[PDB]
Amino acid sequence: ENITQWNLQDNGTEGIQRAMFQRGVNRSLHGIWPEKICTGVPSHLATDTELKAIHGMMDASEKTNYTCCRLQRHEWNKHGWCNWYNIEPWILLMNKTQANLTEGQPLRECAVTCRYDRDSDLNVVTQARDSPTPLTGCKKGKNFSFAGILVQGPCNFEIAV
Ligand SMILES: *[C@@H]1O[C@H](CO)[C@@H](O[C@@H]2O[C@H](CO)[C@@H](O[C@@H]3O[C@H](CO[C@@H]4O[C@H](CO)[C@@H](O)[C@H](O)[C@@H]4O)[C@@H](O)[C@H](O[C@H]4O[C@H](CO)[C@@H](O)[C@H](O)[C@@H]4O)[C@@H]3O)[C@H](O)[C@H]2NC(C)=O)[C@H](O)[C@H]1NC(C)=O
Ligand SMILES: *[C@@H]1O[C@H](CO)[C@@H](O[C@@H]2O[C@H](CO)[C@@H](O[C@@H]3O[C@H](CO[C@H]4O[C@H](CO)[C@@H](O)[C@H](O)[C@@H]4O)[C@@H](O)[C@H](O[C@@H]4O[C@H](CO)[C@@H](O)[C@H](O)[C@@H]4O)[C@@H]3O)[C@H](O)[C@H]2NC(C)=O)[C@H](O)[C@H]1NC(C)=O
Ligand SMILES: O=c1ccn([C@@H]2O[C@H](CO)[C@@H](O)[C@H]2OP(=O)(O)O)c(=O)[nH]1
Ligand SMILES: O=c1ccn([C@@H]2O[C@H](CO)[C@@H](O)[C@H]2OP(=O)(O)O)c(=O)[nH]1
Ligand SMILES: *[C@@H]1O[C@H](CO)[C@@H](O)[C@H](O)[C@H]1NC(C)=O
């Protein structure tokens, strides 16, 4: 039911993806998304010490030099507080998910957004998730590159039939 999405390295894509490439990071968690989006005052303000505990997750914000904690706080506020109720189980979940992503190619990895590279003739995956979704920037009949791993389809498993 919850969508897990993450960023993948790509020097050709300015922002988080280029920063990950330079830092030798292959996969960095974006968020864990239940159906219910949080509205209003969070039940708890996510501190930098708390958010830093999700080891290896990079901020999408250039203002923190892609470290912590603008993306992390935004994720707790928009998707965390109203569904997890307390910060401790959400940090342990976000951190276990990132620790799993750092290991390499996940069991379920589907492209979300691409940057088509004319030189290598590949759909360089900039964001992926654990379930298939309509693509953005991915060119039809071109193979996908998930932080170096070549896959002919949009997922590292079969969807169709
Ligand atoms: C998918 O995403 C959902 C969120 O939409 C996740 O579900 C949440 O899981 C967390 C645990 O990881 C749950 O948090 C705990 O809630 C306890 C109270 O919950 C009551 O019962 C139902 C649950 O069916 C709730 O819906 C009600 O609102 C009730 O409040 C709460 O007591 C508990 O805290 C205790 O432990 C922590 C430490 O773990 C202490 O810090 C704390 O003081 C206290 O002792 C937790 O906060 C949460 O209830 C779940 N939310 C829902 C809506 O079900 C799934 O886990 C996600 N799954 C995957 C695979 O990603
Ligand atoms: C990771 O991705 C980045 C971005 O795509 C890439 O960086 C680019 O690298 C190229 C080559 O080193 C570089 O090109 C040079 O640009 C200067 C002018 O630069 C100015 O303008 C840029 C915008 O156009 C701006 O980004 C710069 O900061 C700067 O203000 C130009 O003078 C160079 O001279 C030419 O050199 C070529 C050969 O290299 C000759 O054929 C030619 O005649 C000129 O002498 C050259 O074009 C580009 O500026 C970089 N862009 C950015 C954004 O940094 C990295 O290369 C890539 N990393 C890896 C490891 O792949
Ligand atoms: O985790 C993230 C967050 C944002 N982005 C993209 O970077 C820009 C936001 O500054 C935006 O270009 C935004 O595009 P979007 O995510 O909305 O598709 C990422 O790539 N990864
Ligand atoms: O199920 C979903 C799918 C996407 N999103 C948000 O929309 C942005 C673009 O897809 C995604 O980058 C994400 O942005 P965010 O909420 O993390 O700011 C969801 O919220 N839930
Ligand atoms: C991490 O991976 C292991 C093995 O696939 C799995 O048992 C565990 O549930 C995963 N944790 C998360 C947070 O996805």
Ligand SMILES: *[C@@H]1O[C@H](CO)[C@@H](O)[C@H](O)[C@H]1NC(C)=O
């Ligand atoms: C977060 O995950 C890392 C593994 O990358 C682990 O070493 C660390 O103890 C975990 N942190 C918390 C707060 O559990």
Ligand SMILES: *[C@@H]1O[C@H](CO)[C@@H](O)[C@H](O)[C@H]1NC(C)=O
């Ligand atoms: C990134 O991915 C490539 C391809 O899977 C791999 O060769 C490389 O070792 C990975 N880097 C890290 C930091 O795990």
